[PDB]
């Protein structure tokens, strides 16, 4: 049965919501793991505390850059970076949630959720996963975000877990 894993969200410390999702293990085994453990914390490393750093309204959040905070750091439980592990799945519209890289196999810890359809990331982003409940607190996030990314308040994981 496919994991489920929730990000309680915080926007300048204040409590906003509980986004879960469902993370597809029977079809990006690798990939669904290394947002699985992360999110748990049980390598040592992982999201709790990190924030969601570009927020683009009609397009996605990014978040996942636990060590930089602004995109250009993280690091997977594998290593630096990982391989593209298959294409399957495409980005239907708002909810998914697929990963960030700077180029062929460069997949670390950065993902972004979308909040439209992206297919131009067809085949180009590994997606993994989607949200199963709150997707109504990623559109309440959206709304701090702003055509250039920059969030007008800072949204926090300030909790993250496996249910």
């Not at 690798?30 to 969601?52: D, I, P």
């Not at 990982?82 to 998914?96: A, Q, V």
Request: charged share 25%; proline share 4%; glycine share 14%.
């Amino acid at each position: 049965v496919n994991p489920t894993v929730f990000f309680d969200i915080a926007v300048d410390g204040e409590p906003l919501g509980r986004v879960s999702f469902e993370l597809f293990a029977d079809k990006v085994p690798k990939t669904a793991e290394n947002f699985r453990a992360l999110s748990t914390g049980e390598k040592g490393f992982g999201y709790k505390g990190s924030c969601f750093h570009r927020i683009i309204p009609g397009f996605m959040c990014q978040g996942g850059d636990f060590t930089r905070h602004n995109g250009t750091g993280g690091k997977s439980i594998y290593g630096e970076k990982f391989e593209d592990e298959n294409f399957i799945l495409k980005h239907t519209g708002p909810g998914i949630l697929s990963m960030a890289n700077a180029g062929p196999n460069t997949n670390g810890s950065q993902f972004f959720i979308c909040t439209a359809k992206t297919e131009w990331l067809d085949g180009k982003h590994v997606v993994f996963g989607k949200v199963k409940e709150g997707m109504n607190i990623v559109e309440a996030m959206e709304r701090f975000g702003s055509r250039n990314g920059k969030t007008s308040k800072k949204i926090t994981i300030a909790d993250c877990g496996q249910l």
